[PDB]
Amino acid sequence: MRVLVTRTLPGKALDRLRERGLEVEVHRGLFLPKAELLKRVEGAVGLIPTVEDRIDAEVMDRAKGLKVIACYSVGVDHVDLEAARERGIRVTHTPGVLTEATADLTLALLLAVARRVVEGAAYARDGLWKAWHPELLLGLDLQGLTLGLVGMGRIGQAVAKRALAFGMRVVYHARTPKPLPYPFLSLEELLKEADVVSLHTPLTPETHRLLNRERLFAMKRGAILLNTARGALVDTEALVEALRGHLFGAGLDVTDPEPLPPGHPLYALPNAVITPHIGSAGRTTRERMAEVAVENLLAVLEGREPPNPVV
Amino acid sequence: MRVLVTRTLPGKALDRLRERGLEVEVHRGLFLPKAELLKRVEGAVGLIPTVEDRIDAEVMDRAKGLKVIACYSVGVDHVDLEAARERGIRVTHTPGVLTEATADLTLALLLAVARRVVEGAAYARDGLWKAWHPELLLGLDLQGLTLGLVGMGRIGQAVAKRALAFGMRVVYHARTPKPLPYPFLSLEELLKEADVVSLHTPLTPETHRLLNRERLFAMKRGAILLNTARGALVDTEALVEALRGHLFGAGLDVTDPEPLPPGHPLYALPNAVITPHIGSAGRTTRERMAEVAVENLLAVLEGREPPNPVV
Lengths: 311, 311
Known about the structure:
The structure is a homodimer.
Chain A: E1 2-5, H1 15-19, E2 23-26, H2 34-41, E3 46-48, H3 57-62, E4 68-70, H4 81-85, E5 90-92, H5 99-114, H6 117-125, E6 146-150, H7 154-165, E7 169-173, H8 187-193, E8 196-199, H9 213-216, E9 224-227, H10 236-243, E10 249-252, E11 272-274, H11 283-301
Parallel strand pairs in A: 1-2, 1-3, 3-4, 4-5, 6-7, 6-8, 8-9, 9-10, 10-11
Helix pairs in contact in A: 5-7
């Protein structure tokens, strides 16, 4: 029995598979052309893909004998679930594991923008730092400001908890209210009253470019936009427009398109902080994700019910 | 009666002094040579300096009539307190008003280092971002980690409150135990068990180079050092050696020397994030510090006790 892992993983979670007599094939590098995936997948009983791998019907048919697709991620939009179901293939993911890490970086971006940390680091690095001054790199004090969360799942709730510790007030909008000690608002009122808007809602036809030109300019002048969820939730070109003078700034860990090309105007805006989708990039988090994917995969191969099934 | 303000301040706090009939001289620019300070302080009854202005006996004797030195800062290591006392000159500062802003920046630096945010921004900006990968820009998850505060005044306590929301454990060291819900440890014990060490103590002959070579290497391999207090508290050169292969990283808002020249080795270490001493650079905070400095100066000139005296 051979298992295909589309990318190298941190930690030694895979050793468990090797200990079980399973043959582990781990693909090295930043890219995996669909052509090479099809070649490597045939004959494999188990598969551990990433969000960068399109696991469609073709891949499944090519993998005559595939029993489980243990996703190295919480999201599974890159896997044709119905195609797998129709083929008796189990599909699992890694829920819960990256919540705190994603929340942490969300906060890191808020602080990075609000207090001009990235900008300040460049200022010192480039030799512009000559002395301390009362008006140098003034940012926004967070105390008393309102953080408006769009989507209140586990990550959104983790972000709210952190925000409260910085003296921020919290409000939120979601498809459904929740028993939380925060005011539930319509998207319209949230954009109107929030000093900082953070996105934490899944991407769907309804949320595709939710933060369009009209909503971005509906936010208060001097507001900050944060997005560590899905790039497509924001109309990138419109964000550039709003950043020239309306919005205080924006912190993005996800973009559209993604990756965001080097010559894109957002990179030329000092009030924009763009990180390369590293929201879950905590070493322990990434190793934990590996352990969970491995557990799910072994579970299915041992004729047991996996702990985090999608199908 | 003339009052000399050594740097321009944000906000209109100074108008209060003008409304009282006081002549207000405010120096513009990033520099104020001592020879220039001496020339302008002569005949002044009040002085509002910054950490950039060394107020020693020479300055005091040149004024010939100075009644109060209302510091626009919380730290006063740049003022000869004993010289002022022997001359009957009052010295005040601005504590409390900058507590939350400084705590925010401290957390910003921790997240910036731990999650490699500044480095990540550069990665995307330079055009190296080509795909998402399980091992790209892996950082340190803060959950479960111990934060050791050396010095537990208002800022240290404010930092602890925020750290707890990120899932961190808090321990601290100070001259004597305080009525706080955290383990009290000796400096030695703290350095040994803390994953993140943050300095929050004033600079004095006893705290000069507190974090020397021996103590920096006494910290855990993989630990993070934060310094938003005073640069001279750390042996900068030893810090460089420790960052090459022992410590995970360091977040510094203060350095020695300050400013730290751009050719300094620390700027070439990606696991070091240096900001230009912007800890209290929250716009509202800086305007409030101005109001507080003004209230203290006016109080002394009015023959009444100032709210935040040091001398």
